[PDB]
Structure 1
Amino acid sequence: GTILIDLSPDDKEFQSVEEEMQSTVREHRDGGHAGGIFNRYNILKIQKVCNKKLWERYTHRRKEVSEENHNHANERMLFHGSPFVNAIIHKGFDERHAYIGGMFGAGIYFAENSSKSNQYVYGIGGGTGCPVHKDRSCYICHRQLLFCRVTLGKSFLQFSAMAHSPPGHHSVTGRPSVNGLALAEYVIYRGEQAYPEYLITYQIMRPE
């Protein structure tokens, strides 16, 4: 039931999604090993993901969470990178999309930094890089990220350098405690708590 609608680059909505992508790139402690070496992207396409069943699944869960948290869903727009973004946009998020070995347990992980999500496009740790050239820093191959609407509800704060949410919480927030420039990462434990709103197709750009 999924339709993808291309946004025009002239559309304010294209522009605001692109700005969130570009503005949340940071350097990574791996020197670019997982995600590649870059400071910015070449955005090739931004598509709106339209699926009525999946949207209704999300909004149902959002109301459940809101009612458990003083009418506050604590909804964010966050990035998600995975080799399975094509499955997600058709079928939704579920346990097959969980990072079993994540530092906050087996859940579905999202990032404020688009470049953090970029590290997972080709698998955990970047896998073996792009399928065509086996290059984690490939500047040629098209990559895709999701920019997702995520319900955090009451989030458990973890200060740090499918399972269940911590009791009394709907998510976990991984707060950076060493790298002063890193943004937060978030984990949900129910696929219904995220909707894959935008599919972004892009390349990383080689620094000059």
Structure 2
Amino acid sequence: GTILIDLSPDDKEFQSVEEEMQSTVREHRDGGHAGGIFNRYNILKIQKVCNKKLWERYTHRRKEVSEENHNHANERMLFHGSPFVNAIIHKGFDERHAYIGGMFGAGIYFAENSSKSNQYVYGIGGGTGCPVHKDRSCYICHRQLLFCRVTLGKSFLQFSA
């Protein structure tokens, strides 16, 4: 039941999503090893993901969290990069999209820096890079990220390197 609606670059929604993508690039301590060497992106397309069933599943859970946290869902918009973006948009997030080895345990990870999610597009640590050229810094091949609505509720603060 998923449909994808193209946003026009003239659309204010296209523009605000593009700006969050571009403005949250940073340099990475691997010197580009995982995600490539770049300061900015060439945005090719932004599509709205529309699935009624997946939306209702999110809003149901959002209300539960909110009622457990003085009516505060603590909702954010955050980036997710994954080799499984096509399965996610059709079936939703589930245990198969977890980072089993992540530093905060087996869960589904999101980033405020778009450039941090970019490091996972081709797998953990960038895998072997693009399928076509085996290049983690490929400037040719098309990449995809998700910009997601995430319910944090009461969040455990982990100070960390």
TM-score range (shorter-chain normalised) is over 0.9
Pairwise CA distance, 1:47: 0.1
Pairwise CA distance, 1:23: 0.1
Q: Which runs of 4+ in 1 moved over 4 A?
A: none
Task: State the distance in 2 between where 1:13 and 1:94 align.
Answer: 27
Pairwise CA distance, 1:97: 0.2
Task: State the distance in 1 between where 2:22 and 2:94 align.
Answer: 28
TM-score by length of 2: 0.99
Task: State the distance in 1 between where 2:73 and 2:105 align.
Answer: 22
Structure 2: gaps spanning 5 or more residues? none
Percentage of pairs with the same residue? 100
Residues 146-198 of structure 1 show CA distances to partners (whole Å, capped at 9, x for unaligned) of 00000000000000xxxxxxxxxxxxxxxxxxxxxxxxxxxxxxxxxxxxxxx
Q: Which has the higher helix share?
A: 2
Pairwise CA distance, 1:62: 0.0
Residues 15-60 of structure 1 show CA distances to partners (whole Å, capped at 9, x for unaligned) of 0000000000000000000000000000000000000000000000
Task: State the distance in 2 between where 1:84 and 1:47 align.
Answer: 17
Task: State the distance in 1 between where 2:117 and 2:131 align.
Answer: 18
Task: State the distance in 2 between where 1:117 and 1:93 align.
Answer: 16
TM-score by length of 1: 0.76
Pairwise CA distance, 1:108: 0.1
Task: State the distance in 1 between where 2:148 and 2:86 align.
Answer: 14
Structure 1: gaps spanning 5 or more residues? 160-208
- Root-mean-square deviation (CA, aligned residues, Å) is 0.1
Q: Which has the higher strand share?
A: 1
